[PDB]
């Protein structure tokens, strides 16, 4: 046999490529960025905090 096996694995490769392309293209995953940076000593002596 083994012709059945090679045809099968070819079809599996094609279907896997299709499904992984869908997996790559479909979702967003773009949460951008959140949270604000904490306070460090360099911030104190910057011109930003001058009263």
């Amino acid at each position: 046999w083994k012709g059945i096996a090679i045809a099968l694995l070819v079809i599996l490769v094609i279907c896997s490529l299709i499904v992984t392309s869908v997996i790559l293209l479909t979702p967003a995953e773009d949460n951008s960025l959140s949270q604000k940076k904490k306070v460090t000593v360099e911030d104190l002596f910057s011109e930003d905090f001058k009263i």
Binding site: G3, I4, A7, L8, I11
Partner: protein, 44 residues
């Protein structure tokens, strides 16, 4: 004993199974995978 020897008069009659051919032919090839490469491919 008649019953015991009787269960073997229908399976040998059923040996021929389906000898009809066509969507019927491809259905026969499908429901029984051991017909061609196509049926094996879909089964697997």
């Amino acid at each position: 004993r008649r019953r015991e020897n009787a269960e073997r008069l229908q399976d040998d009659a059923d040996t021929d199974t389906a000898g009809e051919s066509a969507r019927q032919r491809v259905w026969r090839a499908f429901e029984n995978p051991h017909t061609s490469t196509m049926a094996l491919v879909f089964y697997y």
